Amino acid sequence: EEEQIEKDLQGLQEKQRLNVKRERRRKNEMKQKELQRMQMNM
RNA sequence: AUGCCUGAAUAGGGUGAAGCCAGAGGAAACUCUGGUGGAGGCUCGCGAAUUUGGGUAUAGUAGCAAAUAUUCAAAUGAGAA
């Protein structure tokens, strides 16, 4: 009964952590990409 | 040997390059997983070679000429494999 609560809380917390990590990664990657793209036109 | 003009052809099987998308690691750079995409001195059936049309320059013996399988009935005809 409570095993399901523990499992889904842990799963949602792990998903949240992975989401934070991937958002940080993509934000850095796209900021670098847009900077390079903006600078490549000259 | 090197050309030039105008046409035909430059096929097929396999593999899967940049680039892209989405995931996971690390502060970046960067490295892996899946997909996508469809490229090449990639493969498969000093020297040689490098498709093609037209035009245009520098003893009655040997033997039967070889490309397999012919058969039956009728017609024509002097005479029919």
PDB file of N, CA and C (backbone and C1' of nucleotides) in Angstrom, chain B residues 7-48:
ATOM      1  P     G B   7      23.173  18.671 -77.605  1.00  0.00           P
ATOM      2  O5'   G B   7      22.730  17.233 -78.121  1.00  0.00           O
ATOM      3  C5'   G B   7      22.571  16.148 -77.220  1.00  0.00           C
ATOM      4  C4'   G B   7      22.262  14.868 -77.953  1.00  0.00           C
ATOM      5  C3'   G B   7      22.110  13.628 -77.091  1.00  0.00           C
ATOM      6  O3'   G B   7      20.846  13.533 -76.464  1.00  0.00           O
ATOM      7  C1'   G B   7      23.499  13.130 -78.923  1.00  0.00           C
ATOM      8  P     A B   8      20.740  12.953 -74.972  1.00  0.00           P
ATOM      9  O5'   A B   8      21.049  11.402 -75.142  1.00  0.00           O
ATOM     10  C5'   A B   8      20.193  10.566 -75.904  1.00  0.00           C
ATOM     11  C4'   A B   8      20.703   9.149 -75.951  1.00  0.00           C
ATOM     12  C3'   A B   8      21.040   8.514 -74.614  1.00  0.00           C
ATOM     13  O3'   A B   8      19.906   8.037 -73.914  1.00  0.00           O
ATOM     14  C1'   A B   8      22.796   8.112 -76.122  1.00  0.00           C
ATOM     15  P     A B   9      19.831   8.190 -72.319  1.00  0.00           P
ATOM     16  O5'   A B   9      21.027   7.284 -71.788  1.00  0.00           O
ATOM     17  C5'   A B   9      20.975   5.871 -71.907  1.00  0.00           C
ATOM     18  C4'   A B   9      22.251   5.224 -71.430  1.00  0.00           C
ATOM     19  C3'   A B   9      22.677   5.546 -70.009  1.00  0.00           C
ATOM     20  O3'   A B   9      21.979   4.808 -69.024  1.00  0.00           O
ATOM     21  C1'   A B   9      24.526   5.778 -71.436  1.00  0.00           C
ATOM     22  P     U B  10      21.647   5.484 -67.607  1.00  0.00           P
ATOM     23  O5'   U B  10      23.071   5.649 -66.917  1.00  0.00           O
ATOM     24  C5'   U B  10      23.845   4.512 -66.568  1.00  0.00           C
ATOM     25  C4'   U B  10      25.263   4.890 -66.221  1.00  0.00           C
ATOM     26  C3'   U B  10      25.450   5.724 -64.967  1.00  0.00           C
ATOM     27  O3'   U B  10      25.405   4.958 -63.778  1.00  0.00           O
ATOM     28  C1'   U B  10      26.732   6.643 -66.719  1.00  0.00           C
ATOM     29  P     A B  11      24.672   5.537 -62.473  1.00  0.00           P
ATOM     30  O5'   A B  11      23.438   4.556 -62.253  1.00  0.00           O
ATOM     31  C5'   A B  11      22.279   4.652 -63.065  1.00  0.00           C
ATOM     32  C4'   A B  11      21.667   3.300 -63.323  1.00  0.00           C
ATOM     33  C3'   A B  11      21.476   2.409 -62.107  1.00  0.00           C
ATOM     34  O3'   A B  11      20.330   2.737 -61.343  1.00  0.00           O
ATOM     35  C1'   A B  11      22.476   1.157 -63.827  1.00  0.00           C
ATOM     36  P     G B  12      20.410   2.738 -59.738  1.00  0.00           P
ATOM     37  O5'   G B  12      20.552   1.200 -59.357  1.00  0.00           O
ATOM     38  C5'   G B  12      19.494   0.289 -59.610  1.00  0.00           C
ATOM     39  C4'   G B  12      19.912  -1.138 -59.354  1.00  0.00           C
ATOM     40  C3'   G B  12      20.337  -1.472 -57.936  1.00  0.00           C
ATOM     41  O3'   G B  12      19.239  -1.686 -57.067  1.00  0.00           O
ATOM     42  C1'   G B  12      21.892  -2.384 -59.459  1.00  0.00           C
ATOM     43  P     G B  13      19.351  -1.299 -55.513  1.00  0.00           P
ATOM     44  O5'   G B  13      20.218  -2.475 -54.881  1.00  0.00           O
ATOM     45  C5'   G B  13      19.660  -3.765 -54.680  1.00  0.00           C
ATOM     46  C4'   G B  13      20.645  -4.699 -54.023  1.00  0.00           C
ATOM     47  C3'   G B  13      21.226  -4.237 -52.697  1.00  0.00           C
ATOM     48  O3'   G B  13      20.365  -4.479 -51.599  1.00  0.00           O
ATOM     49  C1'   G B  13      22.967  -5.009 -54.085  1.00  0.00           C
ATOM     50  P     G B  14      20.379  -3.496 -50.328  1.00  0.00           P
ATOM     51  O5'   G B  14      21.825  -3.698 -49.693  1.00  0.00           O
ATOM     52  C5'   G B  14      22.197  -4.937 -49.106  1.00  0.00           C
ATOM     53  C4'   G B  14      23.649  -4.947 -48.697  1.00  0.00           C
ATOM     54  C3'   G B  14      24.068  -3.883 -47.697  1.00  0.00           C
ATOM     55  O3'   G B  14      23.739  -4.234 -46.365  1.00  0.00           O
ATOM     56  C1'   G B  14      25.656  -4.003 -49.447  1.00  0.00           C
ATOM     57  P     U B  15      23.287  -3.105 -45.318  1.00  0.00           P
ATOM     58  O5'   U B  15      24.629  -2.304 -45.019  1.00  0.00           O
ATOM     59  C5'   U B  15      25.768  -2.963 -44.487  1.00  0.00           C
ATOM     60  C4'   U B  15      26.994  -2.091 -44.566  1.00  0.00           C
ATOM     61  C3'   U B  15      26.899  -0.749 -43.864  1.00  0.00           C
ATOM     62  O3'   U B  15      27.159  -0.853 -42.475  1.00  0.00           O
ATOM     63  C1'   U B  15      27.866  -0.477 -46.017  1.00  0.00           C
ATOM     64  P     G B  16      26.198  -0.145 -41.404  1.00  0.00           P
ATOM     65  O5'   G B  16      26.446   1.410 -41.634  1.00  0.00           O
ATOM     66  C5'   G B  16      27.765   1.944 -41.650  1.00  0.00           C
ATOM     67  C4'   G B  16      27.837   3.216 -42.457  1.00  0.00           C
ATOM     68  C3'   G B  16      27.159   4.421 -41.809  1.00  0.00           C
ATOM     69  O3'   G B  16      27.879   5.613 -42.113  1.00  0.00           O
ATOM     70  C1'   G B  16      26.141   3.963 -43.896  1.00  0.00           C
ATOM     71  P     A B  17      28.003   6.770 -41.006  1.00  0.00           P
ATOM     72  O5'   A B  17      28.811   7.924 -41.742  1.00  0.00           O
ATOM     73  C5'   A B  17      30.227   7.888 -41.825  1.00  0.00           C
ATOM     74  C4'   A B  17      30.760   9.184 -42.372  1.00  0.00           C
ATOM     75  C3'   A B  17      30.162  10.435 -41.749  1.00  0.00           C
ATOM     76  O3'   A B  17      30.804  10.800 -40.542  1.00  0.00           O
ATOM     77  C1'   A B  17      30.040  10.605 -44.095  1.00  0.00           C
ATOM     78  P     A B  18      30.189  11.960 -39.622  1.00  0.00           P
ATOM     79  O5'   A B  18      30.792  13.292 -40.248  1.00  0.00           O
ATOM     80  C5'   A B  18      30.409  14.561 -39.753  1.00  0.00           C
ATOM     81  C4'   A B  18      30.160  15.537 -40.872  1.00  0.00           C
ATOM     82  C3'   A B  18      29.075  16.563 -40.608  1.00  0.00           C
ATOM     83  O3'   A B  18      29.533  17.651 -39.825  1.00  0.00           O
ATOM     84  C1'   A B  18      28.757  15.620 -42.748  1.00  0.00           C
ATOM     85  P     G B  19      28.994  17.843 -38.326  1.00  0.00           P
ATOM     86  O5'   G B  19      27.522  18.411 -38.526  1.00  0.00           O
ATOM     87  C5'   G B  19      27.285  19.500 -39.403  1.00  0.00           C
ATOM     88  C4'   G B  19      25.878  19.484 -39.944  1.00  0.00           C
ATOM     89  C3'   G B  19      24.772  19.301 -38.923  1.00  0.00           C
ATOM     90  O3'   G B  19      24.476  20.487 -38.210  1.00  0.00           O
ATOM     91  C1'   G B  19      24.361  17.913 -40.786  1.00  0.00           C
ATOM     92  P     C B  20      24.092  20.413 -36.653  1.00  0.00           P
ATOM     93  O5'   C B  20      22.606  19.844 -36.656  1.00  0.00           O
ATOM     94  C5'   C B  20      21.592  20.470 -37.426  1.00  0.00           C
ATOM     95  C4'   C B  20      20.345  19.628 -37.489  1.00  0.00           C
ATOM     96  C3'   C B  20      19.805  19.146 -36.157  1.00  0.00           C
ATOM     97  O3'   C B  20      19.066  20.142 -35.476  1.00  0.00           O
ATOM     98  C1'   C B  20      19.814  17.357 -37.699  1.00  0.00           C
ATOM     99  P     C B  21      19.034  20.165 -33.872  1.00  0.00           P
ATOM    100  O5'   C B  21      18.025  18.993 -33.501  1.00  0.00           O
ATOM    101  C5'   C B  21      16.702  18.995 -34.010  1.00  0.00           C
ATOM    102  C4'   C B  21      15.954  17.752 -33.611  1.00  0.00           C
ATOM    103  C3'   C B  21      16.107  17.320 -32.166  1.00  0.00           C
ATOM    104  O3'   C B  21      15.323  18.079 -31.265  1.00  0.00           O
ATOM    105  C1'   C B  21      16.362  15.445 -33.563  1.00  0.00           C
ATOM    106  P     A B  22      15.911  18.451 -29.819  1.00  0.00           P
ATOM    107  O5'   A B  22      15.594  17.159 -28.948  1.00  0.00           O
ATOM    108  C5'   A B  22      14.301  16.577 -28.968  1.00  0.00           C
ATOM    109  C4'   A B  22      14.334  15.143 -28.507  1.00  0.00           C
ATOM    110  C3'   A B  22      15.094  14.880 -27.220  1.00  0.00           C
ATOM    111  O3'   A B  22      14.341  15.202 -26.067  1.00  0.00           O
ATOM    112  C1'   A B  22      15.703  13.273 -28.839  1.00  0.00           C
ATOM    113  P     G B  23      15.079  15.393 -24.655  1.00  0.00           P
ATOM    114  O5'   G B  23      15.237  13.905 -24.117  1.00  0.00           O
ATOM    115  C5'   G B  23      16.120  13.608 -23.051  1.00  0.00           C
ATOM    116  C4'   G B  23      16.572  12.171 -23.094  1.00  0.00           C
ATOM    117  C3'   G B  23      17.786  11.843 -22.243  1.00  0.00           C
ATOM    118  O3'   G B  23      17.460  11.627 -20.883  1.00  0.00           O
ATOM    119  C1'   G B  23      18.088  10.952 -24.402  1.00  0.00           C
ATOM    120  P     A B  24      18.025  12.618 -19.755  1.00  0.00           P
ATOM    121  O5'   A B  24      19.418  11.969 -19.334  1.00  0.00           O
ATOM    122  C5'   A B  24      19.462  10.721 -18.659  1.00  0.00           C
ATOM    123  C4'   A B  24      20.817  10.072 -18.777  1.00  0.00           C
ATOM    124  C3'   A B  24      22.002  10.910 -18.327  1.00  0.00           C
ATOM    125  O3'   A B  24      22.188  10.924 -16.924  1.00  0.00           O
ATOM    126  C1'   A B  24      22.485   9.949 -20.419  1.00  0.00           C
ATOM    127  P     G B  25      22.886  12.191 -16.227  1.00  0.00           P
ATOM    128  O5'   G B  25      24.430  12.035 -16.587  1.00  0.00           O
ATOM    129  C5'   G B  25      25.206  10.982 -16.038  1.00  0.00           C
ATOM    130  C4'   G B  25      26.662  11.116 -16.408  1.00  0.00           C
ATOM    131  C3'   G B  25      27.324  12.439 -16.052  1.00  0.00           C
ATOM    132  O3'   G B  25      27.715  12.516 -14.693  1.00  0.00           O
ATOM    133  C1'   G B  25      27.887  11.843 -18.269  1.00  0.00           C
ATOM    134  P     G B  26      27.536  13.890 -13.879  1.00  0.00           P
ATOM    135  O5'   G B  26      28.638  14.859 -14.500  1.00  0.00           O
ATOM    136  C5'   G B  26      30.007  14.723 -14.149  1.00  0.00           C
ATOM    137  C4'   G B  26      30.894  15.602 -14.996  1.00  0.00           C
ATOM    138  C3'   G B  26      30.654  17.101 -14.905  1.00  0.00           C
ATOM    139  O3'   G B  26      31.244  17.698 -13.763  1.00  0.00           O
ATOM    140  C1'   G B  26      30.832  16.476 -17.170  1.00  0.00           C
ATOM    141  P     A B  27      30.460  18.843 -12.949  1.00  0.00           P
ATOM    142  O5'   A B  27      30.250  20.015 -14.009  1.00  0.00           O
ATOM    143  C5'   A B  27      29.430  21.133 -13.694  1.00  0.00           C
ATOM    144  C4'   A B  27      29.782  22.350 -14.515  1.00  0.00           C
ATOM    145  C3'   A B  27      29.862  22.156 -16.021  1.00  0.00           C
ATOM    146  O3'   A B  27      28.588  22.163 -16.640  1.00  0.00           O
ATOM    147  C1'   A B  27      31.701  23.455 -15.272  1.00  0.00           C
ATOM    148  P     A B  28      28.421  21.649 -18.151  1.00  0.00           P
ATOM    149  O5'   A B  28      28.988  22.844 -19.039  1.00  0.00           O
ATOM    150  C5'   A B  28      29.300  22.646 -20.409  1.00  0.00           C
ATOM    151  C4'   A B  28      30.291  23.667 -20.902  1.00  0.00           C
ATOM    152  C3'   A B  28      30.978  23.341 -22.219  1.00  0.00           C
ATOM    153  O3'   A B  28      30.185  23.673 -23.347  1.00  0.00           O
ATOM    154  C1'   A B  28      32.589  24.046 -20.639  1.00  0.00           C
ATOM    155  P     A B  29      29.845  22.558 -24.452  1.00  0.00           P
ATOM    156  O5'   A B  29      31.242  22.293 -25.172  1.00  0.00           O
ATOM    157  C5'   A B  29      31.944  23.350 -25.813  1.00  0.00           C
ATOM    158  C4'   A B  29      33.421  23.057 -25.899  1.00  0.00           C
ATOM    159  C3'   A B  29      33.795  21.727 -26.533  1.00  0.00           C
ATOM    160  O3'   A B  29      33.798  21.769 -27.950  1.00  0.00           O
ATOM    161  C1'   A B  29      34.988  21.992 -24.514  1.00  0.00           C
ATOM    162  P     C B  30      32.824  20.809 -28.796  1.00  0.00           P
ATOM    163  O5'   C B  30      33.179  19.344 -28.284  1.00  0.00           O
ATOM    164  C5'   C B  30      34.498  18.832 -28.396  1.00  0.00           C
ATOM    165  C4'   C B  30      34.755  17.750 -27.380  1.00  0.00           C
ATOM    166  C3'   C B  30      33.957  16.470 -27.563  1.00  0.00           C
ATOM    167  O3'   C B  30      34.505  15.615 -28.551  1.00  0.00           O
ATOM    168  C1'   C B  30      33.848  17.138 -25.303  1.00  0.00           C
ATOM    169  P     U B  31      33.561  14.582 -29.339  1.00  0.00           P
ATOM    170  O5'   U B  31      33.338  13.404 -28.294  1.00  0.00           O
ATOM    171  C5'   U B  31      34.444  12.713 -27.736  1.00  0.00           C
ATOM    172  C4'   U B  31      34.003  11.720 -26.694  1.00  0.00           C
ATOM    173  C3'   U B  31      32.918  10.749 -27.125  1.00  0.00           C
ATOM    174  O3'   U B  31      33.423   9.666 -27.885  1.00  0.00           O
ATOM    175  C1'   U B  31      32.388  11.630 -24.998  1.00  0.00           C
ATOM    176  P     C B  32      32.419   8.730 -28.716  1.00  0.00           P
ATOM    177  O5'   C B  32      31.764   7.795 -27.607  1.00  0.00           O
ATOM    178  C5'   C B  32      30.772   6.845 -27.959  1.00  0.00           C
ATOM    179  C4'   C B  32      29.902   6.485 -26.784  1.00  0.00           C
ATOM    180  C3'   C B  32      28.496   6.036 -27.141  1.00  0.00           C
ATOM    181  O3'   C B  32      28.442   4.667 -27.496  1.00  0.00           O
ATOM    182  C1'   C B  32      28.395   7.650 -25.413  1.00  0.00           C
ATOM    183  P     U B  33      27.659   4.208 -28.818  1.00  0.00           P
ATOM    184  O5'   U B  33      26.131   4.242 -28.380  1.00  0.00           O
ATOM    185  C5'   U B  33      25.669   3.455 -27.294  1.00  0.00           C
ATOM    186  C4'   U B  33      24.196   3.664 -27.063  1.00  0.00           C
ATOM    187  C3'   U B  33      23.349   3.796 -28.316  1.00  0.00           C
ATOM    188  O3'   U B  33      23.036   2.551 -28.914  1.00  0.00           O
ATOM    189  C1'   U B  33      22.794   5.527 -26.823  1.00  0.00           C
ATOM    190  P     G B  34      23.021   2.418 -30.513  1.00  0.00           P
ATOM    191  O5'   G B  34      21.577   2.952 -30.919  1.00  0.00           O
ATOM    192  C5'   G B  34      20.411   2.358 -30.371  1.00  0.00           C
ATOM    193  C4'   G B  34      19.194   3.227 -30.567  1.00  0.00           C
ATOM    194  C3'   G B  34      18.961   3.753 -31.972  1.00  0.00           C
ATOM    195  O3'   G B  34      18.406   2.792 -32.850  1.00  0.00           O
ATOM    196  C1'   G B  34      18.653   5.501 -30.426  1.00  0.00           C
ATOM    197  P     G B  35      18.834   2.785 -34.399  1.00  0.00           P
ATOM    198  O5'   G B  35      17.991   3.977 -35.034  1.00  0.00           O
ATOM    199  C5'   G B  35      16.575   3.981 -34.957  1.00  0.00           C
ATOM    200  C4'   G B  35      16.004   5.365 -35.138  1.00  0.00           C
ATOM    201  C3'   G B  35      16.198   6.005 -36.500  1.00  0.00           C
ATOM    202  O3'   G B  35      15.278   5.531 -37.467  1.00  0.00           O
ATOM    203  C1'   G B  35      16.680   7.580 -34.808  1.00  0.00           C
ATOM    204  P     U B  36      15.714   5.419 -39.008  1.00  0.00           P
ATOM    205  O5'   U B  36      15.873   6.931 -39.477  1.00  0.00           O
ATOM    206  C5'   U B  36      14.764   7.815 -39.476  1.00  0.00           C
ATOM    207  C4'   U B  36      15.207   9.245 -39.633  1.00  0.00           C
ATOM    208  C3'   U B  36      15.917   9.577 -40.935  1.00  0.00           C
ATOM    209  O3'   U B  36      15.004   9.841 -41.986  1.00  0.00           O
ATOM    210  C1'   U B  36      17.106  10.503 -39.101  1.00  0.00           C
ATOM    211  P     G B  37      15.232   9.215 -43.443  1.00  0.00           P
ATOM    212  O5'   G B  37      16.349  10.143 -44.090  1.00  0.00           O
ATOM    213  C5'   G B  37      16.202  11.554 -44.120  1.00  0.00           C
ATOM    214  C4'   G B  37      17.543  12.239 -44.158  1.00  0.00           C
ATOM    215  C3'   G B  37      18.477  11.786 -45.267  1.00  0.00           C
ATOM    216  O3'   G B  37      18.234  12.489 -46.472  1.00  0.00           O
ATOM    217  C1'   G B  37      19.636  11.818 -43.195  1.00  0.00           C
ATOM    218  P     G B  38      17.711  11.727 -47.784  1.00  0.00           P
ATOM    219  O5'   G B  38      19.040  11.470 -48.614  1.00  0.00           O
ATOM    220  C5'   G B  38      20.081  12.439 -48.622  1.00  0.00           C
ATOM    221  C4'   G B  38      21.442  11.793 -48.656  1.00  0.00           C
ATOM    222  C3'   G B  38      21.713  10.918 -49.878  1.00  0.00           C
ATOM    223  O3'   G B  38      23.089  11.010 -50.232  1.00  0.00           O
ATOM    224  C1'   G B  38      21.914   9.619 -47.920  1.00  0.00           C
ATOM    225  P     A B  39      23.528  10.911 -51.771  1.00  0.00           P
ATOM    226  O5'   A B  39      25.087  11.218 -51.740  1.00  0.00           O
ATOM    227  C5'   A B  39      25.570  12.514 -51.428  1.00  0.00           C
ATOM    228  C4'   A B  39      26.962  12.445 -50.859  1.00  0.00           C
ATOM    229  C3'   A B  39      27.900  11.466 -51.548  1.00  0.00           C
ATOM    230  O3'   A B  39      28.508  12.027 -52.699  1.00  0.00           O
ATOM    231  C1'   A B  39      28.022  11.179 -49.199  1.00  0.00           C
ATOM    232  P     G B  40      29.024  11.088 -53.896  1.00  0.00           P
ATOM    233  O5'   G B  40      30.496  10.675 -53.451  1.00  0.00           O
ATOM    234  C5'   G B  40      31.443  11.666 -53.066  1.00  0.00           C
ATOM    235  C4'   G B  40      32.480  11.111 -52.119  1.00  0.00           C
ATOM    236  C3'   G B  40      33.535  10.220 -52.765  1.00  0.00           C
ATOM    237  O3'   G B  40      34.782  10.399 -52.097  1.00  0.00           O
ATOM    238  C1'   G B  40      32.331   8.978 -51.144  1.00  0.00           C
ATOM    239  P     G B  41      35.904  11.356 -52.736  1.00  0.00           P
ATOM    240  O5'   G B  41      36.808  10.361 -53.589  1.00  0.00           O
ATOM    241  C5'   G B  41      36.799   8.971 -53.311  1.00  0.00           C
ATOM    242  C4'   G B  41      37.577   8.187 -54.333  1.00  0.00           C
ATOM    243  C3'   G B  41      37.587   6.682 -54.119  1.00  0.00           C
ATOM    244  O3'   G B  41      36.434   6.045 -54.638  1.00  0.00           O
ATOM    245  C1'   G B  41      39.797   7.431 -54.429  1.00  0.00           C
ATOM    246  P     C B  42      35.884   4.688 -53.976  1.00  0.00           P
ATOM    247  O5'   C B  42      35.526   5.089 -52.473  1.00  0.00           O
ATOM    248  C5'   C B  42      36.433   4.844 -51.405  1.00  0.00           C
ATOM    249  C4'   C B  42      36.011   3.661 -50.572  1.00  0.00           C
ATOM    250  C3'   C B  42      35.841   2.350 -51.320  1.00  0.00           C
ATOM    251  O3'   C B  42      37.074   1.683 -51.524  1.00  0.00           O
ATOM    252  C1'   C B  42      33.982   2.702 -49.895  1.00  0.00           C
ATOM    253  P     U B  43      37.180   0.484 -52.583  1.00  0.00           P
ATOM    254  O5'   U B  43      36.688  -0.785 -51.761  1.00  0.00           O
ATOM    255  C5'   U B  43      36.275  -1.963 -52.430  1.00  0.00           C
ATOM    256  C4'   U B  43      35.164  -2.658 -51.689  1.00  0.00           C
ATOM    257  C3'   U B  43      34.387  -3.685 -52.494  1.00  0.00           C
ATOM    258  O3'   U B  43      35.046  -4.935 -52.563  1.00  0.00           O
ATOM    259  C1'   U B  43      32.875  -2.271 -51.362  1.00  0.00           C
ATOM    260  P     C B  44      35.423  -5.566 -53.989  1.00  0.00           P
ATOM    261  O5'   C B  44      34.167  -6.477 -54.336  1.00  0.00           O
ATOM    262  C5'   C B  44      33.632  -7.371 -53.374  1.00  0.00           C
ATOM    263  C4'   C B  44      32.244  -7.813 -53.754  1.00  0.00           C
ATOM    264  C3'   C B  44      32.033  -8.131 -55.223  1.00  0.00           C
ATOM    265  O3'   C B  44      32.504  -9.413 -55.589  1.00  0.00           O
ATOM    266  C1'   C B  44      30.272  -6.760 -54.463  1.00  0.00           C
ATOM    267  P     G B  45      33.376  -9.592 -56.924  1.00  0.00           P
ATOM    268  O5'   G B  45      32.302  -9.986 -58.030  1.00  0.00           O
ATOM    269  C5'   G B  45      31.479 -11.130 -57.865  1.00  0.00           C
ATOM    270  C4'   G B  45      30.253 -11.062 -58.739  1.00  0.00           C
ATOM    271  C3'   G B  45      30.490 -10.753 -60.206  1.00  0.00           C
ATOM    272  O3'   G B  45      30.912 -11.883 -60.949  1.00  0.00           O
ATOM    273  C1'   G B  45      28.714  -9.425 -59.400  1.00  0.00           C
ATOM    274  P     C B  46      56.409  10.925 -59.584  1.00  0.00           P
ATOM    275  O5'   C B  46      56.176  10.116 -60.937  1.00  0.00           O
ATOM    276  C5'   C B  46      56.086  10.788 -62.185  1.00  0.00           C
ATOM    277  C4'   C B  46      56.378   9.853 -63.331  1.00  0.00           C
ATOM    278  C3'   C B  46      55.481   8.628 -63.434  1.00  0.00           C
ATOM    279  O3'   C B  46      54.275   8.915 -64.125  1.00  0.00           O
ATOM    280  C1'   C B  46      57.759   7.987 -63.655  1.00  0.00           C
ATOM    281  P     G B  47      52.968   7.995 -63.946  1.00  0.00           P
ATOM    282  O5'   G B  47      53.276   6.704 -64.827  1.00  0.00           O
ATOM    283  C5'   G B  47      53.500   6.819 -66.228  1.00  0.00           C
ATOM    284  C4'   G B  47      53.987   5.528 -66.840  1.00  0.00           C
ATOM    285  C3'   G B  47      52.938   4.417 -66.952  1.00  0.00           C
ATOM    286  O3'   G B  47      53.138   3.694 -68.168  1.00  0.00           O
ATOM    287  C1'   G B  47      54.794   3.632 -65.732  1.00  0.00           C
ATOM    288  P     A B  48      52.020   3.725 -69.322  1.00  0.00           P
ATOM    289  O5'   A B  48      51.115   2.449 -69.023  1.00  0.00           O
ATOM    290  C5'   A B  48      51.394   1.193 -69.625  1.00  0.00           C
ATOM    291  C4'   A B  48      50.316   0.186 -69.315  1.00  0.00           C
ATOM    292  C3'   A B  48      48.911   0.556 -69.767  1.00  0.00           C
ATOM    293  O3'   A B  48      48.670   0.243 -71.128  1.00  0.00           O
ATOM    294  C1'   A B  48      48.845  -0.140 -67.517  1.00  0.00           C
TER     295        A B  48
END
